[PDB]
Symmetry: T
Subunit: 166 residues, 12 copies
């Protein structure tokens, strides 16, 4: 599963080391996810743009709220968040591609769903790790982020005419 | 001057090509500037943290508003904004360093001042280019961004006990 | 007509008996209409979900405001509103079907239009009855509810690419 | 205990089947609870009506917020919520009776307390099931709903001159 | 009936003379009703004071909104509203008594119910008269005031443990 | 009377044809009335300008709210509103004159009063027609618009030192 | 002086008897003042109506706030406020006259100034009495009411082209 | 009197020494009063709880606003406020008892009235002392606090069915 | 180009004559543009209506804000704005057609894009003229209006699946 | 012209020296203008006072916002604003006279118009100077201030019954 | 003392002459104090600028609210406030110095404390004078201004690491 | 560890006895913590006071929100919260000292950090106990309080120039 792979990857490289590592992974991934969402906001063309475009700023605002919270939680528990674009891009497991206006609305929606599926799996790894290390506060952070990610998947999937398939 | 160098660099690589290039340069630089500001928000330690920390989120909100406006202006006039972290980091003329908690408040303030001085010079290049190409709307965008950057320099300089020296 | 049939049905089973009966019919029908609208809110899949889904909560809020007003009006004039789910379901003239994700957006819109057409006809019966019995206050309630129902039909019909055909 | 009986009943009829079943049970029960609360709102007579009546709309608003959240959570995790009045009434473990103006304020308060005691027990079953199946997000939903139900029991009990006895 | 008596009295002493007379009667009666409500606000003693006291200011605000609207409507249609305390007190059909702290909460509630019953009957006379004279705008004013008066009767009656008996 | 003439004119050129015609007449007249009000807003000179000028924007906002409501009501009941400036100007019974700064404040006030007197008479025709055709919803629309027009006449007349003379 | 006469009159008919008497005098006078202000609100005709009319509702709101505060203060200190229109009209030292549309704006302004001059003198008597009886709380109430009355005199006088002459 | 005893006690142990002592006495007493009010908020059982419980938080918010103001005033005039729970409890003249759920609503109301009667007497001592020492600013603070305390006594007494008896 | 033609047309028929002429041209064109937008608001049918319909009121509000600003600017600089529907319709370079429900959503979007392209070209003429005549304030007005028009073109084009092509 | 004289005067006594001088001139003049406006606010007597008086506080608020912006802009670009009353009064080109209550409303309006005409001419000098020295940000500041000054002239002139004559 | 000297000075040059003189002294001093505060706002450099700078605008807003209130009180009681910068500067007992960026934060804080100490002493003189002349309303104005000045001294002193020493 | 000691102490003296004991311990400790925070609010002197002082009221508001929630949770689950100052002071594990103005800002910050470290350890004990006893609702309460305490430690530590060291 992606969850096993994320776990393996996060814990490859102190009592809360794995929690710090998974939080930092989320710093990088939230930063890349925000960049991807912004790309949709800007490059989208097609019917529905007029409600999808502002929807991207709502998703963006939430991703950025997640980022600040995750990173401040990481600092709070004695870690050191990635804090440069090169660190985000190297450590994130999300890929980016050059923006192009010729992607269809359907392609943007599928990409967003993949981003949120990835984030929900990362957060599940965050749940497992924080349970193992006994960090209830960070577990609650990951629980809320996963729950919101899953709801977002359901809604984007619905917009695509599909079930949540999460 | 930095202004001459930015101009040379922007126009090194259609009736509004240079305006599009300078806007895109601003996309990259605003993105890196936001990242730098976030790093201060997170890594700062020292007396004054309790008002400087939320001040960074205000600066961040403004930089991100600038970014969206600049990028949508670029799209509007027929360009294609950078829209990945790797593009921001490669094309930006701002450098980033790994976050460290041992930077002093004075070092963070000096870094912010350098970022805003850089942005104000970039915007001056934007003014020259948009005047040359007759893009009044983009000229107004750069005028407001420069004016706000300059005010920010004055205030950060004041916090450092210095004059604006812009 | 549906109006004749609703009238016949309402008045089949005191100076304001028919007004009380038509108000109570509206209690049952508003309750079922709200349930139907909620089903669309939940089960819808397809392009447009992202504005249609919150639109259902707006329609729902209005139906529930109608319900409380109608029921309190009924109480106020000396009646006794239905106040259990089994009473709503037995006395309502609206049918419900088990939710299914495979209904198309077009089917949900057609169903909503039928619900509002039904409600507007019920309210017309409410107008006739309250005029006959001289209840100006309840007549005004039905007038506003009918007017809002008719506007809703026009807008939902427009979303379907059709005229109001009311 | 009621908790054992609810569990037995929910799980009588895939990795998250029991979580889906308990969420759907909550759909039905929240719907019936809202109906019961509305009946108090409408039929109550006696000293205190003027603050108890609007209190019922507050309880109602919260029950309806719970309903939408529970049902959207159910959809999100791959289930299918009850979405007709006949399904709510058949599957709910709460009974309803015909409204009557001759119930005393004390009887309405006792009924509300029983409804919330039932809901808190249902949510405890939701906690057990979501812990067993590893659904942290749904566990958090049930935790918050139980906590709010318990607080509501304490306050309604206090209004009756009694301790929470939960 | 009180309605017949109010009508007789109003029309005892131009195309809209009776509408003007009934509006002016409402000026006087709303003014006295407000005074009565204020007396309850001030003189009430007993359990429930803490929600009944502010409830009187809500009733008062509505009565005063009614007064201004009625009086401006009267002016608008070519009449001349009573506009002194002696005119209100002489022409009103409501009686006042000296305030006393020894009235019970039950007595205040009964008095308020009588005031609103009187006002609803006056408004019914306003409905009959405005229908007869073809003043739709003033008819709508009386319809809304009657509907609000009737709702108020239902709620005050409920607080007394009684049905609306309107 | 003007009312007879408006009626004759509206019904000169289906169960609700006259209601549709009178609504469409209101579309044209509201559009011209708004234009006239705007002309006062712009061209007025004289003492009182500083409260009369913003008063024109309030009158304008209300006229435009009326216009949208009337036109959407017309659409809702199966008609087709005028929707070009040439249609408004040809079908409106209100005349316009070229703006001039030499009109006195008194002349602007007299003109506004004539506009509102005209609109109130048109709305009376709307009342008669909607009563005849049994359109309660449109009757309520015209009732509220007439009532507001009449109040506006009273206030503008008062500003002129005159009675409503409606 | 009017102050001597008010004092004589108030104290003509326990440790705080005079404070209670002066507060009750204010109950009656505030009630009559509000009635007078309302009469101006309704009957005024002439240039300036459009800002003077809403100004009367502001003055009215303040007078009614004064009334409630004065009367609740009276209750609080062990008195019994006038609470019927006949008591207000008999005990007030302000006279009322039948409303007439032929009063000029200048006459309304002069009347308001006389009302406020009277109230400020009454409040001065309230200051003297509360100082004599050692009621600091009621003294503060009268101080604020006098200060506001005096400011109102200055502004109304200014509108008349006159100095405060208080 | 209690006032004489408070004075004696306050001034038992510089130009404003007595003002500082009475302010500090208020620090201690406001702190204990807040604790007592909180105890009612938590331990109350009986009809009326649902409006009395939030009423305690309003009383609490005001007591805490008083506390901060009194203590900052004390600091401002050169004193040193009590600032530990042991100082509040030792120096306050209010007694506390262990919370118990078996106190009746009537007992809680009587206790609150005693607390406010005590506070109003303390504030009267504050008035006498600040007058004697010429501290107008602190006199105004005590005047407003006494006036609010007295109003609170009137309202709580009314809820008990009694007059203010202050 | 359209820009050359608008210029030629505006300046065909004092130090700021051309600025006044171009502002007045904008008065006429903004008025016709608003009418066209309203026609879309009313006549549109098809999927997307539910977000496109309110989008038209946003566009309308902005066009009307532009109109008032342009016209007040014209007055301010010594001109005389068109202020009748016949002047708007004769002098505007925008054509209108009778509303019809059979236009597709795509046709409405194309028409809006043409309107905004026209307005942006008119504003460019306004920029050239105000630069030539040295009217910086009016130049700023046209700059902001052009920038907003261009952004609107980009967004409407995106909704059509197209690039801005401005 | 006044513009030539202001220019001569400003530049009588570094790359942005003239921009700094004109900004500082505006510091002094805005300060004196605010003082003049305050004098009207206080000393005015005559019909219209009740809307003109609060209008002066609006003008005052804007002048003070201008002052802070101008002065902070001056600081930002490396200057040193006047910051004492004696500097404002010596360097301002506006004269003040002792307040007197015998100035007519017409005299106050004429004085305000002269103040704003002066300020608009000063801002024109600011435009010329900032264009010459290439300070786009300060040019934008002067453009907005001039545009607002000109609008204010138009409105005050209108209140006087005159055209803008700017 | 400064209080004796202010008194002597104020009363050196009718029943309320001294109250008018002390109010006018406050007009001049508040105006100079505002100017001084503005100078700190602009010229400050040093750590803490970022919270001290906006703190100056808060102090400024309060000083300007004081100024308007004092001056309107003076007008209200029959005086004539200073209303030119030259009058403020001549009659104020506060001195100003040319702004300079080389003042330290500590120097600005000490200066502000001296300004507020001066104002509190002036207000004490206002208290003595208004007590002597029996002007309770103006006494209350000075009491509130003194109390606020004293609190401000305490807080600024605290920022300096000092006690209030008032 | 402190956690072991708190646990030992809490459980030294029914299915949820330990949860009730730890909640009650939090009642006492939150009450003492609030008192300590208030002492800093009042007694602090030194640079930074102007942002640290209001920061204490924010911390205080949160501590008091925690207190009410904890205590109501305790009541809700069948316990009895401490509710007198003597109980808080005896049972709290936090010590208080007499306020003194000579504590440095650094000492206040260190004390606050110790308070929050203590509270976070107490909440960890609350987590362990609620997990052991199966109280998910109280576990969530302690999780949120711990998370907020930890964030507060990070920020206060940062203000001291230190890492969170939690
Ligand atoms: Cl890296
Ligand atoms: Cl690249
Ligand atoms: Cl049934
Ligand atoms: Cl079923
Ligand atoms: Cl009479
Ligand atoms: Cl036509
Ligand atoms: Cl009497
Ligand atoms: Cl002690
Ligand atoms: Cl023409
Ligand atoms: Cl000088
Ligand atoms: Cl002088
Ligand atoms: Cl104890
Ligand atoms: Zn956008
Ligand atoms: Zn955006
Ligand atoms: Zn790395
Ligand atoms: Zn933060
Ligand atoms: Zn942040
Ligand atoms: Zn690249
Ligand atoms: Zn939803
Ligand atoms: Zn929903
Ligand atoms: Zn049945
Ligand atoms: Zn209700
Ligand atoms: Zn309700
Ligand atoms: Zn079933
Ligand atoms: Zn009250
Ligand atoms: Zn009240
Ligand atoms: Zn009479
Ligand atoms: Zn305007
Ligand atoms: Zn306007
Ligand atoms: Zn036609
Ligand atoms: Zn009115
Ligand atoms: Zn009114
Ligand atoms: Zn009497
Ligand atoms: Zn509570
Ligand atoms: Zn509470
Ligand atoms: Zn002690
Ligand atoms: Zn619409
Ligand atoms: Zn619309
Ligand atoms: Zn023409
Ligand atoms: Zn004023
Ligand atoms: Zn003012
Ligand atoms: Zn100088
Ligand atoms: Zn600033
Ligand atoms: Zn500022
Ligand atoms: Zn002088
Ligand atoms: Zn404070
Ligand atoms: Zn505080
Ligand atoms: Zn104990």
């Amino acid at each position: 599963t992606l969850v096993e792979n994320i776990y393996a990857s996060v814990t490859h490289n102190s009592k809360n080391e794995k929690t710090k590592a998974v939080l930092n992974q989320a710093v990088a991934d939230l930063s890349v996810a925000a960049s991807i969402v912004h790309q949709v906001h800007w490059y989208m063309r097609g019917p529905g743009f007029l409600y999808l475009h502002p929807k991207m700023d709502e998703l963006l605002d939430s991703l950025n709220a997640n980022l600040d919270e995750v990173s401040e939680r990481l600092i709070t528990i004695g870690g050191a968040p990635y804090s440069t674009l090169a660190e985000f891009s190297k450590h994130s497991k999300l890929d980016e591609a050059k923006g192009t206006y010729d992607k269809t609305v359907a392609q943007h929606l599928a990409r967003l769903v993949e981003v949120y599926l990835y984030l929900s799996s990362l957060y599940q790894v965050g749940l497992d790790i924080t349970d193992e290390e006994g960090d209830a506060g960070t577990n609650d952070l990951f629980t809320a982020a996963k729950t919101e990610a899953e709801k977002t998947i359901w809604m984007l999937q619905a917009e695509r005419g599909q079930g949540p398939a999460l």
